[PDB]
């Protein structure tokens, strides 16, 4: 039967021995950026550098 990425919810974590570690099966709560002054939280590790755009194209 289905997974948990369908029926968003359960969060999921991803690790890369070559790219940036991630979490997100469901954590973006989209439309939550609409609220003004949602200042972007500066990542300390500064990961997801433009979603690892470096060498992607």
């Amino acid at each position: 039967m289905l997974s948990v990425a369908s029926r968003s919810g359960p969060f999921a974590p991803v690790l890369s021995a070559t790219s940036r570690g991630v979490a997100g099966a469901l954590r973006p709560l989209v439309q939550a950026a609409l609220p003004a002054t949602s200042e972007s939280p500066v990542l300390d590790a500064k990961r997801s550098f433009l979603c690892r755009e470096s060498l992607s194209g």
């Binding site: 289905l2 997974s3 948990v4 919810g9 969060f11 690790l15 990542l43």
Partner: protein, 418 residues
């Protein structure tokens, strides 16, 4: 063509190889492991296993794994959840047979050496602090702790007292009891079938059985509060609903899209969200509300999820709870069910377009059910959901024992009995 081949081996291993004619390939290995299967003594062993993929194994050192994979431009990556783990490799077509022998060394014969595990213990603190810069990550770990007594309350990240203390003997024990043959699925996307079969007869030599059975999850109706200095209040309010692979599970999926479960138009006001329009009548301040829905093998959680300012967190949760009450007492139009069946069918087909979304879905079906069903079968089951099942799912929510988790400045958040 050749839509999927599907074999179940004698030791319960499921192989599924599809032959596209794309220049790139992808190979996955999907295992039944995860936080669910750890008890009170070895909490955090699954977070350390997730970080230890490019350490020394019996067939390739930690230099040759990093250098041999970067030489051809390949990737190696691990994704896990509360109920499964997934190892995934990828390269171009002619390079696929060398990145496939590395993957069977990372997961089927690892060596946990002392000085490498000890140097790795500082990575647990880095990975947990990266994940927890999002407020949605800890509110959802708290919510599983407030909803269960065991076996689904364990977090995906290691607890703070326990960093520095995960031993090499505990990692050897988690793989020896949970990475077995009858809990695994090998899925290939640019490979032929008889070569993926000849790869899989290189870990038959042992771990051919079932593994440590998982305790059943007992529902606790709890409440965990977390005062801190964040600007907005994140709050979740759920109840127990339905396991995956049942007739009632599809109706909670349809009820999720009736209420409103995400966006469709960039900077849109969510006009077909009954949850969002009911809240926004009296609330004029920045907020966000959604329907939460999680589903596991023997239980699931359905409820709401709000993000709001701290002095308005009571008005937002109360408005988003009267609207679910209006559905359970019969106020349910017929075109609202039909517009919600489209979003559930369309989103299932857009989720399977990529090579990672397709390989995700085939891996979940091989662990949960042991078969593959075409997306025409899945699209019929969604259209068989009646209006008498959307109402009998909002009745199970309204009369069920609740659970809660909150974060922020909690001076105006209601208590779960209030």
């Amino acid at each position: 063509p050749q839509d999927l081949e599907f074999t179940r081996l004698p030791n319960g291993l499921v192989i599924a190889s599809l032959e596209n004619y794309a220049p790139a390939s992808r190979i996955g290995l999907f295992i039944k492991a995860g936080s669910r299967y750890e008890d009170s003594n070895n909490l955090g062993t699954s977070h350390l296993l997730r970080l230890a993929s490019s350490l020394t194994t019996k067939g390739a050192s930690s230099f040759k794994i990093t250098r041999g994979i970067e030489a051809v431009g390949g990737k190696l990556s691990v994704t896990s959840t509360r109920e499964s783990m997934a190892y995934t490799v990828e390269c171009l077509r002619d390079d696929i047979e060398i990145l496939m022998e590395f993957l069977l060394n990372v997961t089927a014969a690892p060596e946990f050496r002392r000085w490498e595990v000890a140097a790795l213990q500082s990575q647990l603190r880095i990975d947990k602090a990266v994940a927890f810069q999002n407020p949605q990550a800890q509110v959802l770990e708290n919510l599983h702790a407030a909803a269960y007594r065991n076996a689904l309350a364990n977090s995906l990240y290691c607890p703070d007292y326990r960093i520095g203390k995960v031993t090499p003997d505990q990692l050897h024990y988690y793989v020896q009891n949970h990475f077995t043959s009858a809990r695994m699925a090998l899925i290939g996307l640019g490979v032929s079938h008889p070569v993926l079969k000849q790869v899989a007869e290189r870990f038959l030599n042992m771990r051919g059985g079932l593994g440590l059975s998982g305790a059943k999850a007992k529902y606790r109706g709890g409440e965990i509060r977390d005062q801190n200095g964040d600007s907005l209040v994140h709050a979740a309010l759920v109840a127990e609903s339905a396991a995956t692979g049942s007739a009632e599970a599809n109706a909670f999926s349809v009820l999720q899209h009736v209420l409103g479960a995400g966006p469709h138009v960039k900077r849109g006001s969510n006009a077909t969200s009954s949850l969002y329009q009911a809240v926004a009548k009296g609330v004029h301040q920045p907020f966000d509300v959604s329907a939460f829905n999680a589903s596991y093998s023997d239980s699931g959680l359905f409820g709401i999820y709000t993000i709001s300012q701290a002095a308005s967190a009571g008005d937002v949760i109360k408005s988003a709870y009267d609207q679910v009450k209006a559905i359970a007492q019969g106020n349910l139009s017929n075109t609202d069910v039909q517009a919600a069946k489209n979003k559930l069918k369309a989103g299932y087909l857009m989720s399977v377009e990529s090579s990672e979304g397709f390989l995700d879905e085939v891996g979940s079906q091989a662990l949960v059910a042991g078969s593959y069903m075409q997306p025409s079968t899945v699209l019929q089951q969604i259209d068989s959901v009646a209006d008498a099942d959307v109402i009998n799912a909002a009745k199970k929510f309204v009369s069920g024992r609740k659970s809660m988790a909150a974060s922020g400045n909690l001076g105006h958040t209601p208590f779960v009995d209030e």
